[PDB]
Amino acid sequence: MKTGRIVKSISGVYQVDVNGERFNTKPRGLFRKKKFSPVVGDIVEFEVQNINEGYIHQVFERENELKRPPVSNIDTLVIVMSAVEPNFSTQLLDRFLVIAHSYQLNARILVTKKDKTPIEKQFEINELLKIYENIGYETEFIGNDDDRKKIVEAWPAGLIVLSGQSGVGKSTFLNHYRPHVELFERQNGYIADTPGFSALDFDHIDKDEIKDYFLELNRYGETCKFRNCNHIKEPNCNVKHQLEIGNIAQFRYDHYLQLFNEISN
Amino acid sequence: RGSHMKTGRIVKSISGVYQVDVNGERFNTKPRGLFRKKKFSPVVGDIVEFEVQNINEGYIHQVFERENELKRPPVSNIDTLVIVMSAVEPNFSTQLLDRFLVIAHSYQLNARILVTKKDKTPIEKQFEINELLKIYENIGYETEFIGNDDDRKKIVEAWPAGLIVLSGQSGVGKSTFLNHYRHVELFERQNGYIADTPGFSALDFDHIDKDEIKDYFLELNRYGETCKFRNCNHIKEPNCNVKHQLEIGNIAQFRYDHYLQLFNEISN
Ligand SMILES: [Zn+2]
Ligand SMILES: [Zn+2]
């Protein structure tokens, strides 16, 4: 028996990587079901046959997954934002982070097009990224002067998936590895060759979960007077309080309220 | 207005006054003479009978025989020792966990296993760890694997009734469980109490003989019953059921390996 990640799917043959060695595996004889469809990202236990073939015994229960593209067990969603063309937007970035955590994904932030960004504007984005760093995210600000392969190689261990709108430069990263979805090797893991549905979407989300996905509202929410305080019109609200003494950025709370209202309608 | 003689647990010990919890009510008790005359040696966790004096104080009558204890810190009558290990920072070690379980059972403590930092752990490593925890489960331990997402107060509340002591080394996430509650003190929870402790160490080559080690590998204990050899240490003895169960996969190699290393280490 061997364990590894499915990196490639084609006509019901699943290619599992085990310590850099590829095995062309299939489902064992019995399996056809609603719970019988492996995806790229799946961790499987398989029995070796014919040197580099095998028969999948179990698919481990997925920690997470996306439907478009179909990919499971994502270790880090990199949210890719351009500094210009279009302008860096905390409204958009806050939306993306919320959707990331709605799918249970760890996220980090990558800003592109530094070399096309006026330095005064660069310094504005820097102070904004420090508020995201306060909240708990890793942030990077790059342009054409930075080695993209080494950026990708240095990201945390495991499966990287890139997410972000068209034209932010995701393919500039994905073409150091590439030329449906396939995983490619990094020194300490993998990267998917297809972005996470680009401008990512929420799937099902209720108005009461949004505060969970603002990680600082989540934290500061723990002592709000009301049990399930939405931090909107509740008295004795510690989010309102931490906002008032400046440990929550106003744009974060503004975006929270906008999204809360959007989801209710 | 209540009864005269009461039984409960010492939750706090400060300068010769022993605070005793009787059904959620605290009584500050001591021996009924000069503190000098050293009559009782009570420890946090002790079950004691006292006579009620001046409303919410008392005279200790009797400390019941300890079912178990630690000397460091000094705490008796532990219902569950929770061994807290990180998945990462530092890396999960079946070597260290096996050692901790041996110390635990050497003090006749029931143990369970808590792994932290799931959220900092690459998913492929998480599944490796889930696969190792299933082996400890087959051996008969309760196991949990948590990160930041999980509700601590809730987990710490859902553990078996009575006194929980968390044990594990520096920087593993233990402080985080206790902050929903706050030498040593017990804090009330629904269904019992909880306390802290800084992990084990010089407790192996402290009171354990080479011949006891196999008692505290719970599956070696159980399989050892039908070894032909008297006092079988499962090393080179023939007609060894441990060696046999191992050969057919009922004992994990890493368990037998850790047993062998520890045995050789205590032969010094
Ligand atoms: Zn609130
Ligand atoms: Zn034996």
Side-chain angles (χ1 to χ4, degrees), chain A residues 1-31 36-67 69-148 151-177 179-186 188-196 199-206 208-224 226 228-265, chain B residues 1-14 16-35 38-53 55-148 150-169 171-182 184-189 191-204 207-227 229-268:
Chain A
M1 295 288 216
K2 280 174 145 64
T3 299
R5 196 173 283 264
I6 301 180
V7 297
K8 210 208 323 210
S9 191
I10 180 185
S11 302
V13 40
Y14 303 93
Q15 192 179 109
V16 184
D17 181 44
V18 187
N19 296 331
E21 173 174 22
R22 302 309 165 82
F23 298 75
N24 296 312
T25 72
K26 294 157 79 165
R28 265 150 81 253
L30 49 129
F31 280 133
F36 177 80
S37 217
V39 300
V40 171
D42 274 336
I43 315 306
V44 313
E45 181 187 50
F46 74 94
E47 197 176 36
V48 175
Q49 199 57 286
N50 299 329
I51 325 310
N52 55 14
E53 304 185 344
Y55 288 102
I56 287 172
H57 269 74
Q58 50 167 351
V59 186
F60 295 115
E61 213 208 318
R62 299 160 179 163
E63 278 311 274
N64 65 57
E65 59 189 306
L66 303 177
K67 300 313 185 302
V71 57
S72 63
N73 295 321
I74 303 170
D75 286 303
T76 305
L77 191 76
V78 186
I79 298 164
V80 183
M81 298 263 304
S82 56
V84 295
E85 305 172 3
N87 287 353
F88 182 76
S89 166
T90 66
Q91 184 170 66
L92 193 50
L93 177 55
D94 290 353
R95 182 167 323 264
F96 284 160
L97 289 168
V98 170
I99 291 168
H101 306 314
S102 84
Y103 291 114
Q104 310 258 76
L105 303 177
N106 296 334
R108 64 181 289 132
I109 301 165
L110 176 65
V111 190
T112 64
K113 302 203 189 154
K114 182 175 191 180
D115 53 275
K116 302 199 181 183
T117 306
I119 288 146
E120 285 177 61
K121 211 77 176 56
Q122 285 183 27
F123 286 19
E124 276 165 21
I125 294 162
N126 295 339
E127 294 298 285
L128 289 174
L129 289 190
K130 275 190 265 169
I131 292 165
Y132 288 97
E133 275 167 10
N134 285 335
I135 294 174
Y137 300 104
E138 301 297 308
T139 76
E140 278 177 294
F141 194 173
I142 63 144
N144 252 247
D145 292 309
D146 306 296
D147 172 40
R148 290 188 169 98
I151 287 157
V152 178
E153 284 305 307
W155 286 336
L159 171 53
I160 303 297
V161 180
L162 302 192
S163 189
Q165 292 174 319
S166 337
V168 303
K170 291 180 299 296
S171 48
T172 313
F173 288 89
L174 289 189
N175 290 349
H176 283 97
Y177 296 92
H180 196 165
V181 53
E182 185 168 356
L183 314 180
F184 290 101
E185 286 187 344
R186 308 185 298 121
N188 49 107
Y190 305 96
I191 179 150
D193 75 352
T194 304
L200 199 40
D201 239 276
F202 244 148
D203 206 4
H204 221 346
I205 163 83
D206 295 327
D208 38 277
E209 303 165 29
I210 294 171
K211 59 192 173 278
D212 311 327
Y213 308 145
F214 284 76
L215 302 190
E216 83 271 47
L217 301 208
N218 196 45
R219 196 219 318 178
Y220 287 134
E222 282 163 1
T223 66
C224 285
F226 286 51
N228 306 130
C229 184
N230 286 329
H231 339 291
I232 302 270
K233 272 285 209 262
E234 287 82 343
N236 257 220
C237 182
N238 187 48
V239 166
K240 291 291 185 51
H241 179 50
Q242 295 317 292
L243 181 57
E244 186 175 349
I245 68 169
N247 296 296
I248 303 172
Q250 184 68 49
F251 72 79
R252 288 285 294 172
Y253 180 72
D254 289 347
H255 296 147
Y256 168 67
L257 213 44
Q258 295 157 22
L259 284 175
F260 191 97
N261 278 289
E262 168 175 1
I263 298 310
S264 283
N265 291 28
Chain B
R1 299 213 334 180
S3 85
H4 171 252
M5 278 267 159
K6 288 169 190 309
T7 294
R9 203 176 274 264
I10 297 174
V11 289
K12 210 200 316 301
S13 181
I14 303 170
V17 78
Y18 304 105
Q19 192 175 87
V20 177
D21 196 325
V22 187
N23 295 330
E25 179 183 3
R26 312 305 189 77
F27 300 77
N28 296 329
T29 76
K30 55 194 165 165
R32 65 169 60 256
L34 190 73
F35 305 110
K38 222 275 177 161
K39 291 182 153 177
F40 306 83
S41 40
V43 137
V44 163
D46 272 339
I47 309 316
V48 311
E49 175 169 47
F50 64 98
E51 190 170 357
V52 176
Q53 299 295 112
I55 309 144
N56 64 15
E57 310 170 294
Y59 289 135
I60 293 168
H61 177 240
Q62 204 188 344
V63 182
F64 295 104
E65 183 179 24
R66 299 179 184 141
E67 191 67 0
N68 60 58
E69 45 177 343
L70 300 181
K71 305 206 289 287
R72 35 185 178 283
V75 51
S76 68
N77 299 323
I78 298 158
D79 292 298
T80 312
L81 189 84
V82 181
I83 296 157
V84 192
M85 312 235 329
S86 55
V88 298
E89 312 195 305
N91 283 339
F92 192 74
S93 164
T94 55
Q95 164 96 107
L96 185 57
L97 175 54
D98 290 353
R99 275 151 190 278
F100 278 133
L101 288 169
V102 165
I103 308 298
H105 299 319
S106 80
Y107 289 117
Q108 322 170 81
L109 305 174
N110 295 341
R112 68 185 286 129
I113 302 165
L114 176 64
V115 188
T116 59
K117 303 196 181 158
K118 192 174 206 185
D119 63 288
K120 297 211 189 69
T121 298
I123 286 154
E124 290 177 62
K125 185 65 64 179
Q126 292 180 23
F127 289 2
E128 289 172 24
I129 290 168
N130 297 340
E131 285 306 297
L132 300 181
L133 288 180
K134 282 187 173 156
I135 292 174
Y136 289 98
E137 284 176 346
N138 299 341
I139 293 174
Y141 299 112
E142 295 297 307
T143 76
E144 280 167 297
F145 188 2
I146 60 140
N148 279 128
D150 297 282
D151 184 8
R152 303 257 188 287
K153 185 181 176 65
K154 179 160 293 189
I155 292 154
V156 169
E157 291 273 312
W159 287 329
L163 171 54
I164 308 294
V165 173
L166 266 41
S167 167
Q169 61 191 17
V172 147
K174 196 186 313 182
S175 311
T176 85
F177 293 89
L178 279 316
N179 292 337
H180 297 259
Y181 301 101
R182 290 131 81 140
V184 48
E185 171 166 356
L186 313 182
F187 297 103
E188 268 183 56
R189 57 184 194 97
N191 253 226
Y193 306 92
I194 182 161
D196 206 277
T197 179
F200 301 130
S201 42
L203 299 129
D204 246 322
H207 72 289
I208 304 181
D209 263 53
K210 22 164 57 177
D211 286 285
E212 279 133 32
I213 297 158
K214 64 182 179 289
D215 302 346
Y216 312 141
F217 281 74
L218 290 197
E219 82 277 50
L220 295 215
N221 190 74
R222 218 174 29 74
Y223 287 125
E225 268 169 23
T226 50
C227 291
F229 243 82
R230 170 209 168 155
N231 193 36
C232 194
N233 278 320
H234 325 299
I235 312 204
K236 288 317 232 309
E237 288 80 351
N239 302 293
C240 185
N241 189 41
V242 163
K243 306 297 269 296
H244 170 68
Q245 290 314 308
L246 178 65
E247 275 165 31
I248 65 170
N250 294 331
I251 296 172
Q253 181 61 39
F254 82 79
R255 288 282 286 175
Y256 181 75
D257 285 349
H258 298 156
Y259 169 67
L260 219 73
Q261 293 154 13
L262 242 176
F263 191 99
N264 289 315
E265 198 175 301
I266 311 302
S267 308
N268 288 53

